[PDB]
Symmetry: D2
C-alpha cells in the first residue's frame, strides 16, 4: 500500500492568516480522497523571510518534492499567479506528473480567449477537456466526475 502523493503548491504560506485558514481546508479536501499531501511551507518549514543560508536548501527541497511526487495541485489564484508556483508547475509538466489547477478567483488574467489564464499554464493538459483538471471551488475538489478523482481510481 502506497498512497498517491500530491505536491500542494500555493502562495498561501506567505500570509499568516492565509496559512492558517486557507491551506488546512484544501489539505483536508485532498486527503478525504486518500491522498498524501506534501505541503511545502510545513515540510520545508518556511514561516518568514528565509535566511541567506536557508534559501538554497528551501529551493532544493521544493525541487526534490516535485521530482518525487505523483501529481501537483497548483493554487493559481492571484493576478498574476505566484511566480514560485509557476516554476514548480513547469517542472511538473516537464517531468510528466499529473497536473491539477485551482482558481476560485473570478478575475481573468489571460493572454488568449480559450483559457482564463496565461496559456502556458495549460501546456501540460489535453487540448480538449482541460476544464476537467481546473477546479474553481474547494467543494469541487472531491467531485467524482472530475479529473483528480478519476486519476486516483482509474
Amino acid at each position: 500500500m502506497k498512497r498517491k502523493i500530491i505536491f500542494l503548491a500555493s502562495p498561501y504560506g506567505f500570509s499568516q492568516q492565509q496559512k492558517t485558514l486557507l491551506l488546512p481546508p484544501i489539505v483536508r479536501a485532498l486527503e478525504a480522497l486518500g491522498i498524501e499531501v506534501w505541503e511545502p511551507f510545513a515540510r520545508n518549514n518556511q514561516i518568514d523571510f528565509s535566511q541567506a543560508d536557508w534559501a538554497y536548501r528551501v529551493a532544493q527541497a521544493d525541487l526534490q518534492d516535485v521530482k518525487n511526487c505523483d501529481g501537483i495541485f497548483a493554487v493559481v489564484n492571484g493576478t498574476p499567479p505566484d511566480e514560485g508556483v509557476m516554476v514548480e508547475l513547469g517542472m511538473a509538466i516537464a517531468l510528466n506528473k499529473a497536473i491539477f489547477l485551482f482558481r476560485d478567483d473570478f478575475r481573468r488574467c489571460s493572454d488568449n480567449e480559450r483559457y482564463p489564464l496565461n496559456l502556458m499554464l495549460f501546456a501540460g493538459l489535453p487540448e480538449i477537456g482541460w476544464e476537467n483538471y481546473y477546479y474553481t471551488s474547494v467543494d469541487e475538489i472531491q467531485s467524482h466526475d472530475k479529473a483528480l478523482y478519476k486519476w486516483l481510481t482509474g
Copy 2:
C-alpha cells in the same frame, strides 16, 4: 565557440512598444555571441490576443522549443516576473537545460535575503556563484566573466 540554442523567454512581446524597442536589442546581444536565438513571439507568431483555436498550438510550440533548446535566457523583469516565463523556466530546470536570468529592474520582489527574487527562480543555479548567471544590463550579456560566455566556450 559552439553555436548553442537559447530560448529567449520574456514578456516583452505583449506590449507593442516593448516588442519593437526592447526585444531586438536583447536578441542582437545574444546573436553577437554567435548564439541561435529562438524568440517565441516571432517564432510562434504571437502578435495579439491569441485566438481560441490557436492557443493550444502556441502553448505546445513554446513547450517544444524549451524541450529542444540548449539553454533558456529568462527575462524576469517585473513585480512579479511573468508567469509564462516562469513556467517555461521551470520546464528548463527539470530538463537540465542551461539557465540564465536577466533583470535590469532595480525593484526587489523577493521572499528571502540571498536572491533578489523568489528563491525558486534560482533552484537550477549553483548555491555559490549564481551571480555569474544573473544579468542586470544588456551590455553585461557579452562579458567573458559571465556564465553565458563560458557556457559557449565549453
Copy 3:
C-alpha cells in the same frame, strides 16, 4: 454612541474562500474597536464578473464610500498589492482621510529600503513613526499602542 467609519479595501472578495474565511476575522477585529466598517464587497453585491452596465455602478460605489469615510484600512497583501485597493488608497490620501495599512505577507515588494512596499503607499503617512500605522497581523489590530486605537481616542 458616535462611531468612526473605516473603508476596508482588500482583494479578498475576488476569491470565494478568501471572502468567506479571511474578511470576517478582519471586520471583527475592527468592530471590536468600536469602529464602523464599510466593506465594499458586502455593500456592492459584486460576486462574479461584473456586467458592463453594472461595472460603472460598482466604480461609483467604491468612490463615494471612500469620499464619505473617516479613514481607509487597506489590506496591501500580495506581490504587488491589488490595483483597485491602490486607486482607493490614493483617493483617501488626496482627501486627507486617515490611513492605515495591513500586510501579514512577509514578502518584500519594494522600490526602496525604508518601506516594505512602493514608497508611494506611505505618502499619506508620517515620515517618522509610520510603522505605527502599519499592521502585520490580525492580532495586532487590538493594540492600544498602535495608531488605529489612538485615532479613535482623539
Copy 4:
C-alpha cells in the same frame, strides 16, 4: 497644460531610455509640459532610506499641482505607485488619461479591459476616447487629449 506621466518605465534601465522618451515627445508635440517623475525627482536607484519619503512627497505634490495625469497602465497588474497617483488625480478632479498597449486582459468585469476602478474618473459613455492603445494615437485629433487642450 501640464501632464504628470505616471509610469513604471523608470524602474528598468532599458525601459527608461527607450520607452519613456517616445511618449514624452508625443505629449510635448501636442503642446504639453510633461512632468516625468523619475527624471523630475532625479532618483532612479533603490532609494536610500533617508530619501524615500522625499521622493513620495515630491510626486504627491506633482499630482496636486498638475492639470491632468497620463498614466501608463501596462502590465499584469498595473504598477501600484501609478495606481496610487491615479486615485489621487481622480479625487482631486484632475483630467485622467490612460495608456495601455499591452494586449493582455486583467480585469474584474467585462466592460473595462482592467479593474473597473481605474475608470472611475472617466464617463460611463465614451470612456474609450481617453484610452490610448499606441504611441501613434497620442497625437490623434479625434481623441480626448487633443480636445482637452482645444477648450
